[PDB]
Structure 1
């Protein structure tokens, strides 16, 4: 049992209560009780965590990300439109990674993520097809203690239209191999079903498995319908990348949202990612079927895609979470940095300093994010009965001083290093910035290994790591 005491609790509960000098009691992975110190004595606990002078929040929820690609950041990944990045960087880089590289990628990602207060990660696994990768990744997620949705991507249909464009893009890095990860529909089903049977609900309920048809052009109608029915039969969600680029825009003369509507493929268990190339009608169609959304505001900028209509969706009460997207289209895994970006980009583009409140941005990173993953009954707020995914932030630093309104301070001032202590499913995963799965005496050597492995991955893939200085 664990008692967190004397903090300010930012509950994100139904009344958005903010409780000064208050406590939380945790038992068997759950929040069992809460109270105010002046009115009540906290129950006895095996241990007390002192949060005096600190702010307690629900853990941040990364609503859509791609983990293993983190080893491709730091030089190779920037300055390219989506498809250029995909074909010259992501596909070949992923392919050159071995299972032992994956294990290091995952631990590096989880170290950055937990340090920034992320406790749930929706991993869209585009490299699950390669032998050994699932097993390597899953062993590290389990050990680390993070809550993970492992959304297994598949592609079962050739999009032949885009080929002369692809060859031109490939000529930018001709020594880098063009890859294919297409699989037959029935093979994808069997592989995802077996993955779910083996890993879903493992690591004490912390790991889930979803089917992830990649896009409306890369997956057949049958494949998407299978994913849809699978989500329904197993009480999970299914997810798809929607309208991330201007070449996706026209699946057969209508938008991807329209196309899915025609086939009855929009439902309340679908979470779509991106939605940059969206019009009013598309928003209406998602709204009507209660589709969940993950917005990758930073990555949409990094890749030169654009700006999604998040304010419109939010004003319709839609469940919109925030994803950091790829470890190499951001290039950080920092929810607080992404929140600030979500606040500012929309203000700038609408010329409206009040287009999204910092409270609302904080909601997107917590309780609404949970809702976007279909997990809001279990996580995303500090409420009795929910899982004990909790973070303690210290605002006593120069950047976060002064602080009066907590959501404003967090969104507009915090850098992302203010998170001290992190609980996931009631287990202490970080304490005073010390990571339980990467102790301080191993941290530097681990980073050097990740650095070396990245350098080697890029050599095997024939990718340029450090292009010559260019001002224009």
Structure 2
């Protein structure tokens, strides 16, 4: 039994009573939070190592409820300015295709480096490139080494959407030299591939890695395919996830909303996590609420791609589990939970013309405990409580931007930039300490970033994509 003691911190527990514990400590053992206490009232147990958190804030690790990792190598100029499908077919698919396994490994490490730096400890990777050979293995090796907690949601597409062909062909003419790609696969092939992947990797890296099935959308997946995924999630006590209504061209499947359609086939349940709820109406919300569907809101990305604004307050006010996702590494274009929290707070205040539509406490909940709920993992993660995993982060507010600070949630949401996280523990392991990354040490950092830059450039050459378009004011 390895042990760790975090001492003299202010504990923002996000526990049942939302306790905030001044000058207090956390005892960790074998990856689990085993006890907590107040220093004035109790003495911490002896431990192999002590981390002094004096003058620091301790939080549960942030949870990235829905993201796409590999695409991070496509940010920096190629990705912006485009509506969802334009982005998807002229950038994302062709760019992903051009990526070799050694490229994917770098992307994953880069993504993880930025994520951990910003306090993110759990990542729901929606993987659209798992169809390409060697990619999975390359990625999983890095996830495991790095020590992050990962849900690997293996996306599949088993159905052509014939309605949208002419639209796509027209979009492709924008970059006619980038190649029109298809990642469709037969239903049975997808089942086999995902089942294999689950059998092999689910529970690996010390319980840190999970595998879920991810039918892509209601228009790109058959009923048979979604029913399988639903059944799979139930049989294996995990979740399934689906992208739902992310553009106005998806808004309507068979004369009804995607939620309506899913309801018709008995496809809304408590183990479903839907992502992207922009094109939702009152009824869609009601249906999701009725069946206890979990939600991931990609607020920044919904803006970036010009989709719009989801009805998060409406869902939250009904006690639904809504987490925050950064979305793609190239539809954001950061991996920074704090920046996105700020954005979640502000965009909804602005649109509702209501300064109190979401409290910063609530936003912080979305990033932590509620996010865990949306992953069906709230029993294991999301709060500083005895029994739960030691996924913990230490923030230093001793900086200009976060001075003064009194109310910690307000300070974090409205002031912090994302560089104030100091130490990060995942499953009891020290992944980052005084901003030094265990899986990317400072003496190796600059060289690694140069490798990532190069590979990115090369990827874009191979895909025939324009990296740096001409200066454009309008």
Settle same-fold status: TM greater than 0.5: yes
**Structure 2 CA distance, aligned partners of 1:205 and 1:168?**
46
**Structure 2 CA distance, aligned partners of 1:315 and 1:353?**
15
Q: What's the offset of the Cα at 1:72?
A: 0.0
Q: What's the offset of the Cα at 1:133?
A: 0.2
Structure 1 ranges of 4+ moved more than 2 A: none
**1:167-220 C-alpha deviation (Å, 9 max, x unpaired):** 110000011000000000000000000000000000000000000000000000
Q: What's the offset of the Cα at 1:307?
A: 0.1
**Structure 1 CA distance, aligned partners of 2:12 and 2:277?**
30
Q: What's the offset of the Cα at 1:465?
A: 0.2
**Structure 2 CA distance, aligned partners of 1:319 and 1:244?**
19
**Structure 1 CA distance, aligned partners of 2:307 and 2:249?**
11
Q: What's the offset of the Cα at 1:265?
A: 0.1
Q: What's the offset of the Cα at 1:4?
A: 0.3
**Structure 2 CA distance, aligned partners of 1:443 and 1:344?**
34
**1:375-423 C-alpha deviation (Å, 9 max, x unpaired):** 0000000000000000000000000000000000000000000000000
Q: What's the offset of the Cα at 1:249?
A: 0.6
**Structure 2 CA distance, aligned partners of 1:263 and 1:39?**
56
SS in 1 for 2:207: coil
**Structure 2 CA distance, aligned partners of 1:310 and 1:161?**
29
SS in 2 for 1:32: strand
1:56-455 matches, within 5 Å, as 56-455=58-457
Q: What's the offset of the Cα at 1:255?
A: 0.1
Q: What's the offset of the Cα at 1:244?
A: 0.6
CA RMSD of aligned residues (A): 0.2
What number of residue pairs does the alignment pair up?
Answer: 472
- Gap runs ≥5 in structure 1: none
**Structure 2 CA distance, aligned partners of 1:157 and 1:3?**
52
**Structure 1 CA distance, aligned partners of 2:277 and 2:263?**
15
SS in 2 for 1:183: coil
**Structure 2 CA distance, aligned partners of 1:157 and 1:165?**
17
Q: What's the offset of the Cα at 1:56?
A: 0.1
**Structure 2 CA distance, aligned partners of 1:206 and 1:36?**
30
- Gap runs ≥5 in structure 2: none
**1:291-326 C-alpha deviation (Å, 9 max, x unpaired):** 000000000000000000000000000000000000
Q: What's the offset of the Cα at 1:437?
A: 0.2
**Structure 1 CA distance, aligned partners of 2:126 and 2:46?**
41
Q: What's the offset of the Cα at 1:162?
A: 0.4
Q: What's the offset of the Cα at 1:23?
A: 0.1
**Structure 1 CA distance, aligned partners of 2:313 and 2:213?**
28
**1:302-356 C-alpha deviation (Å, 9 max, x unpaired):** 0000000000000000000000000000000000000000000000000000000
**1:268-310 C-alpha deviation (Å, 9 max, x unpaired):** 0000000100000000000000000000000000000000000
Q: What's the offset of the Cα at 1:132?
A: 0.1
**1:108-152 C-alpha deviation (Å, 9 max, x unpaired):** 000000000000000000000000000000000000000000000
**Structure 2 CA distance, aligned partners of 1:188 and 1:304?**
31
**Structure 2 CA distance, aligned partners of 1:195 and 1:173?**
35
SS in 2 for 1:165: helix
**Aligned residue number for residue 466 of structure 1:** 468
**Structure 2 CA distance, aligned partners of 1:67 and 1:378?**
23
**Structure 1 CA distance, aligned partners of 2:167 and 2:428?**
50
**Structure 1 CA distance, aligned partners of 2:283 and 2:50?**
52
**Structure 2 CA distance, aligned partners of 1:375 and 1:301?**
28
Q: What's the offset of the Cα at 1:68?
A: 0.1
**Structure 2 CA distance, aligned partners of 1:292 and 1:264?**
16
**Aligned residue number for residue 55 of structure 2:** 53
**Structure 1 CA distance, aligned partners of 2:365 and 2:210?**
23
**Structure 2 CA distance, aligned partners of 1:306 and 1:182?**
28
SS in 2 for 1:239: strand
SS in 2 for 1:177: coil
Q: What's the offset of the Cα at 1:247?
A: 0.4
SS in 2 for 1:204: helix
Q: What's the offset of the Cα at 1:234?
A: 0.0
